[PDB]
């Protein structure tokens, strides 16, 4: 089926530049017009730009005219958006979309963050279960992911093999302007003696990959 995969989003200083890509497959790229749509955090969808099937008829939202350039390479089945002179108000998820009558395929989007603040990787601390093996019932253990910027981080457990009972909570935005979150997994108390628990923390904006073993106190 149809696939649209955006890439190139990231953190940039105001006035900076970024180029987004959208790799397409599962359809004849060259006979579809293509577009970009964006969405600021917690805000609504905003159309950005469109381009004709053969690279003509480029159009732009006024909010973006003179700063962004849409283009495509039908030989590489790729759509681009060059974004210059970026400002905080350009912070958004950017979606690639195939323009068609009767259907509407979208990518998952790529996150663009425009800020004067630098990226900060997280510090990771284990959250040990208070309940011991003998005490019965269930035990909650976790990882605290402290003081990072920007969003997001993902947290997995045992390299992705432990998924049941996993809850990664929404992050708090602290007054410092840095985020923190926690991920908890609830397991049988009797498993604490025999099973290893490692949280795998990923913060792509800082290229941070941390594995933290979480052990009874």
């Amino acid at each position: 089926e149809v696939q649209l995969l955006e890439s190139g989003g990231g953190l940039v200083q105001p006035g900076g530049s970024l180029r987004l890509s959208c790799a397409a497959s599962g359809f004849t790229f060259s006979e579809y017009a293509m577009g970009w749509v964006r969405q600021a955090p917690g805000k609504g969808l905003e159309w950005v730009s469109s381009i004709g099937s053969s690279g003509g008829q480029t159009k732009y939202a006024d909010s973006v005219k003179g700063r962004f350039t849409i283009s495509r390479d039908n030989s590489k089945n790729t759509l681009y958006l060059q974004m210059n002179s970026l400002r905080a108000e350009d912070t958004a998820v950017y979606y690639c979309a195939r323009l068609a009558i009767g259907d509407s395929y979208w990518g998952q989007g790529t996150m663009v963050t425009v800020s004067s603040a630098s990226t900060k990787g997280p510090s990771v601390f284990p959250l040990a279960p208070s309940s011991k093996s003998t005490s019965g019932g269930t035990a909650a253990l976790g990882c605290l992911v402290k003081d990072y910027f920007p969003e997001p981080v993902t947290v997995s457990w045992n390299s992705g093999a432990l998924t049941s009972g996993v809850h990664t909570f929404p992050a708090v935005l602290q007054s410092s302007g840095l985020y923190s979150l926690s991920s908890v997994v609830t397991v049988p108390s009797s498993s604490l003696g025999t099973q290893t628990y490692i949280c795998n923390v990923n913060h792509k904006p800082s290229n941070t990959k941390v594995d933290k073993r979480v052990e009874p106190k």
């Binding site: 969808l45 469109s50 009767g102 601390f125 708090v172």
Partner: protein, 211 residues
């Protein structure tokens, strides 16, 4: 010139609701190109209606679209909890231009009261060795989505160093929130107990940790 939608529409399970989308003669009153999208948190928009009234394949007939004048309308019948989401109309507007509506947040009421689960963790040894200390109070599986959090140290309140999220829905349709209390290792070591108190619909759930 974003098409105008009601910001918020609430309904009860099994009822019908209608979301209006009012534009100008240049887009809505200029084409039968009004589409409706459904957006769940953290996902791409999903096309539910195109060409005013057509459903793409796979879309339930509970969703229907109409249009008269400069105003398009999306009606959802047989309201289900999964319909809780954001909805956007959109129209072509000539010359390769598209305009999206301002969006409507649909809320589906009726789920039962759920008391919060509270889990409280003390500072880790690793963190104290880093000359820091954070107490983590995690609150989950509650409805409705409002809590109040209070921290106490040997019974006496603490307000400094407290940072608490706004509640938001989990994948199980109940709310979660977090509260963090920042302390120096010396404060943490200088008390017998610290407590996280969570109040929800008159009832207080509390947990306690000690060095």
């Amino acid at each position: 010139s974003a098409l105008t939608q009601p910001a918020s529409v609430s309904g009860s399970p099994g009822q019908s609701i209608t979301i209006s989308c009012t534009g100008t003669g240049s887009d809505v009153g200029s084409y039968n190109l009004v589409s409706w999208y459904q957006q769940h948190p953290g996902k791409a928009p999903k096309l539910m209606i195109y060409g005013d009234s057509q459903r793409p394949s796979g879309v339930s007939n509970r969703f229907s679209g109409s249009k008269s004048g400069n105003t398009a309308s999306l009606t959802i019948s047989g309201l289900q909890a999964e319909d809780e989401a954001d909805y956007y109309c959109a129209s072509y507007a000539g010359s390769g231009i598209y305009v999206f509506g301002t969006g409507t947040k649909v809320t589906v009421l009726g789920q039962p009261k759920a008391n919060p689960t509270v889990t409280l963790f003390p500072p880790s040894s690793e963190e104290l060795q880093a000359n820091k200390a954070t107490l983590v109070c995690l609150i989950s599986d509650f409805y409705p989505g409002a809590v109040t959090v209070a921290w106490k140290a040997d019974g006496s309140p603490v307000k400094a160093g407290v940072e608490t999220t706004k509640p938001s829905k989990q994948s199980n349709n109940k709310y979660a929130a977090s509260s963090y209390l920042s302390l120096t290792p010396e404060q943490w070591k200088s008390h017998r107990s610290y407590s996280c108190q969570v109040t929800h619909e008159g009832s207080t759930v509390e947990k306690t940790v000690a060095p």
